[model samples]
Structure formats: C-alpha cells, structure tokens
Target: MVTDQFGMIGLLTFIRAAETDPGMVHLALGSDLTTLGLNLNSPENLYPKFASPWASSPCRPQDIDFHVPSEYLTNIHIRDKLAAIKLGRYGEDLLFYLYYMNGGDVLQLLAAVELFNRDWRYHKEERVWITRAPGMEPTMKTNTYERGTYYFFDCLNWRKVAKEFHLEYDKLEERPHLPSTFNYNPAQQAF
Candidate 1:
C-alpha cells in the first residue's frame, strides 16, 4: 500500500488552491520567508524516488525556451527563483508561488519534495542537501526548435517518474472527475 509521507497531498492541495484562487498565490510570493512542512528529502515509501536537479544561482528567462507570456516566470529562470524551496526553506507561500510558475506536474512534484523537506536545522544552513545540476542541459542532438539551445532537463518525461506520479496520484485520490456537478449551468439557459 502507498502512503503520503512525503507531503504530496499538501502539495496537491496547494496546486488546487492556486488554480481556484490565483490572487492568493500572488500574495504569498511577496510575504514572509518563514519555512513550513515535512522533511521530504529523506527516504519515504509513499512517493516513488527519482533524481532531480538544481543550480548554484537562479534561472534566467532565456534558460527556458518554451515559456509563454501569460504564465509566471516566463522571463525568469524558475529553478533559480525557486532554489530556496528545494532546500526546505519554504512555507505555505511556496504552494502558491508554484502555481504561478506554470510548471508541469512532474517538475512541480520535484520542487514540492525539496520544499517540503523542511527541518528546524535546515533554516540555519539554508543550503540544498542534494548535489546541484545546471538549470538547463544541451539536448543529446540538436535542432528544429532552435539551432543550439539547452533545455530544462526536469521538464522532460521519464517513463518511471511520470508513471509513479499517476499511480500514487490515484492512490491519493483527493479530487476526481464527477459524472455530475452540484450546480451545472447550461449554455442554452438564455433561451
């Protein structure tokens, strides 16, 4: 059986909340820097394990090629700005900050773990326990998109990582599609 020791549930809640009320996300980004949550860096059975990356400094907007203007961090290196969260120097505010970034679930899940790995001692060090990697890496082979550009490795799909998130996600099962809604407004109502 699977468990949620890594605090993925809370992370999911944060994602959902941000989707519902993005203003709250904007609010948290500028608020206190106090940290909160569990120590996710440590081993746990609840979530599947995998390697993720971080960098010495923040990511520049140019680092990510696929970003759009409407989303947060379009012109910023998300990894750079989010470095604090990965090392466990995060707070409930992180939940919202993540939503604004427009990152995919896989990347968000990786960030949530590091951010969730909060401990009293970590506050003093304020450094990441995991070894760091560059915010972006050259694709094995180049081309059609950009002649010579690097990509954020974390954004790519790995069979194992994505597969596990889905399985455990179903296991967590906080919100699922409903056949009917409590309040359904029809387009034809104006008639």
Candidate 2:
C-alpha cells in the first residue's frame, strides 16, 4: 500500500471540510504562490512529506499553450480540478495528489502506486520526489494548460521499471458513471 504515513491526515481533513462547505473551495492561478499548502520546495510545510511524487513549478501565463480561464480555476470546485486531471493520459502523474487531497479511494490509491515508481526517486533530505534522468533540470515552469505539473511516473521510463502489477488496475470493480454537471473539460483547455 502506498501510504501517506507522514501527513495524510491533515490533507484528508482539509478536503473533507471543503467537500462539506462548497463555499470554502477556492480556485487559484497556476502561477499563484498561494496554493493548497503543498509546496515542493518546503516539503516540511506540507502535510504529506512528498505530497505527490514530483511537481512542476508554477509557470507564467504565456508559457501555457492551452488556455484555462482564471475564472475556471477560481469558480470551480476543487473536485472538478481533480476530475479534470485524472481523466487524461497523464492522469497517473496527478493521482497521488488527488488521492490525498480529494479523498480518493482504494482503486485510486492502487492506481497511484501502480502508476508511480517509474523515473521517480524520493529525496530523503528534501522530502520531495526527483527524476532519474541525469542532468535534467527541474522545471520551474509548466506548459499552457496546467498551472502545475507533478508526476510520479513518466511514460518514457516504463521499460526500465518492473511491471509486476501491470494488470492491477483492471481488477478494480467498475464504478458508476455520474453525468458531469460542469461546463468545462479538464483535459481540453479553453483557448
């Protein structure tokens, strides 16, 4: 089990509170320094030591190729942000954060663990996750669509890692599909 032995409790408490009072949820710019307190540089400040495994620093608005309106980030429930990122191809990269922050279930947890471990190395001193790629600089900037980019696994590293739990995700019981009430698509950024 990929347990959040360090600070899962605090994050879980935060999410649950927001889940109850929709008014408490706030949207944020991808570049805003004020976030859910999950800072990559100050891992000690965040609840979970590693938070998610990797993180992409806040990027400038121009650096983003896909345009997500600031209103969406601010107006929408944090759940939508969670749903948006999880429904994409890069979903695994965001799963751990969603898991802790959104009250993700066992399936989510399993998916997170299964998806991570590739090209990721946890830094004990910093309590942050780093890449296995030599000489690759940590990105302080992300692309057009996302405010931040955090990854536990990269598709490119799949070959080098063990695939022992490859089919674990398939065994999860199918969940009921709820019709989306939101007007936006997390995967497709508005231009």
Candidate 3:
C-alpha cells in the first residue's frame, strides 16, 4: 500500500463513542479510506489487515499533530463533533488538525473507538441500522444521488434515506431509524 498522511494502511477502523457513556455510539471504519489505500497512522507506513501484525500500531490521538487541527474543533460543540464522528463525517484531516494542537482526550477518543473494535465488528455495529444521509450516492442506485456526496452505496427507498456510498456488510431493507432510540409515543409515532 502507498504511504501518505494516513500512514501506510496501518489502521482499518476508527470509532468515536460517548466518552462518559456507551448507549449510542459512533463508529468509523478505515475500510473507506483503505479502499483508496489509506489509513490513520500518520507520517509512518502501516500495513493492511491481511499483512498481519505489521498493520498493528498505536492509533494517534486526534488532539495531536496527525489529522485535523484543533482550531476548527473549538468552533463546534462536543455533541456536534460526536455526531459528526459517529457519521464518519469527521475527516481524518480534521482529526489530525485537532491532534496536531494536542486537543486532548477528544483526539484520543477517535483512535480508541477504532482500536477497541479490533475484531472488525462493523456488520454488527451501526452499519446494520442508521439511515443513509440525504443526497447520497450509491453504486447500486447509480443514476440517483450525487457522484460522491453521500457515504452510503445503496438504498432501501426509505423516503430520503436512500443516500449512501459503497455499501459494506449489509444493505438496508428500509429507512433505518434515526433517533437511535425506542423512547417514543405510539400515538404520536415520534420519538
């Protein structure tokens, strides 16, 4: 694999869950970048999974010099960042920025999420649920959604939830639940 900013495919997954809680979590798989031949090790070269322990390395903290800087981090709140991180919208460049400035545990959270999963539990994680973002592009849908806007790669025709890109693990049968909760009123149908 080619060596660059994300290192040498040293990593395969990156997650960001609630630091103080667990209930609803945010996970980001490096597989997306890996397909493009990229990982989040930063500076050094990381091997791919099939390469064995060569790909093993300590994930860098998001608040240090690796991914995105901390300047933009201050612009958003923790909740917002958590949502972005969970959605895999938090680009490594952004994470590296915050890490470069020593933003603190917030940066480490990203790596921890990825490192903890170790077993590649993606199929059992959020990917099985969650609806696709709006205006998404899916390889299956083809003519639908933008070229590379949405991250999902398929569609269940869940209203506006058909957005996606390069789907992995499984496909959605319908619009995946949003609220990510069961607390709702049967009469109101609103959680």
Candidate 4:
C-alpha cells in the first residue's frame, strides 16, 4: 500500500520555522555552483536536471519556452532571474509536498532498518564501517531545510533528517495546509 515515510513533520517544521523567523534567506542556493544553465556549457535546452521531481519546477525538456525563466545566466547566453526564483520556489514547494505526503513512513522504516542492520558500511577503498552499539549501525544521516527554498530537504544528519526533514511539519500548534507555492503563476511573465 502507498504510505507516507516521514509523515508530516518535515514539511510542517520547515514552514513553521520559516514563517516564525520570516524575512531571512530560507532557501539554499549555490550549493551547486552550476545553476540556471551556466558554466556547464550545456545548451539552455540541455541544462542539467535542476528541475526534477526533487525540484518540481514543472518545466519539461521540450517545454523550455513554457518552463524556463526569462532572465537567468545573463553572464551566459540567456538570463532570467525572476524565472530562476520562481523555479527555485517551485522546487521548494515540491519538497514540502513530498515531505507532507511521504515523510513519516520513510523515516520510520529507514530507522528500523538501521536499527536492525547493526552496522552500516559501504564499498570504499577499504570497507569502512561506523558502529553504534556492540552491533548497531551509527546514525549517519542528517536532515535540514533552508528557509527560503524547499526543493531539497537537507539530509546530512539521520535523526535530524528523519525528524525535521522527513516528517509531517506543523507550526507546533496550528492549522495544517500545504506550504504556499512560492509566488509562482504560470500566467505571469518570467521577468
């Protein structure tokens, strides 16, 4: 059956934090130096998968005319700053929905697996393992959310990731609603 992984905490928490904090750089930009079809030298049409299910920018490859921003990479051939922000916000909203829809289930299941696994290791130059208890896996994942953008729920810490990034998030004690769609209107010009 289709189930939510983290449930509703991640999305709700981020929204609460952002609304309460208000007026700060909530979004994480520049994590990847390559954004909006720059430096990668890929054609505007062939840009990297910046707007995927992860980002939810809604712009498909063939629909560049409809999906792409109007002013980005001015330093490059095309520049669409407004469109960039919209795309960014769109992605951020997508993250919120994803968390809302599938936060609790994923986190709990993963946690259970971690608990049962006893240890977690990967194929490295020399198989390295991080141990928690006598035979328990260490917590090796983190979760975080940038206030401005929500496309990516940070997962650098497991517990935090599970709780804050991958669960149903509410404003502690408030109504529940999907995070706002970051001022995006398909009808508006890309600016």
TM-score per candidate, chains pooled: 0.18, 0.21, 0.17, 0.17
Give the number of the best model, judged by TM-score: 2
Q: What would the per-residue lDDT of candidate 2 be over residues 35-144, giving only the tens digit for each residue?
A: 53345466454432433323322333333456677776664567555544333455534544443333323444444444343444332333333333444343433332
How many residue pairs clash in all the candidates, one count each? 5, 6, 30, 44
Name the regions of candidate 3 deviating beyond 4 angstroms.
1-93, 96-133, 137-149, 152-166, 169-191
Write down the worst ten-residue block by lDDT for model 3.
114-123
For each candidate, what is the lDDT?
0.32, 0.39, 0.36, 0.34
**Candidate number that wins on TM-score, 1 or 2:** 2
Regions of model 1 farther than 4 Å from truth: 1-87, 114-171, 174-191
Tell me the deviation in Å of residue 14 in model 1.
Answer: 47
Error of 3 at 15 (Å): 41
Off by over 4 Å in 2: 1-88, 91-93, 99-108, 114-117, 134-191
- Per residue, candidate 4 scores C-alpha lDDT tens digits across 77-169 of 545433542222343234334333343234333332332243322212221122222332323332421121111123333121121112111
- Candidate 1 local lDDT, residue 17: 66
141-170 per-residue lDDT for model 3 (tens digits): 443222333422122442223333453434
- Compare candidates 1 and 4 on lDDT and give the better one: 4
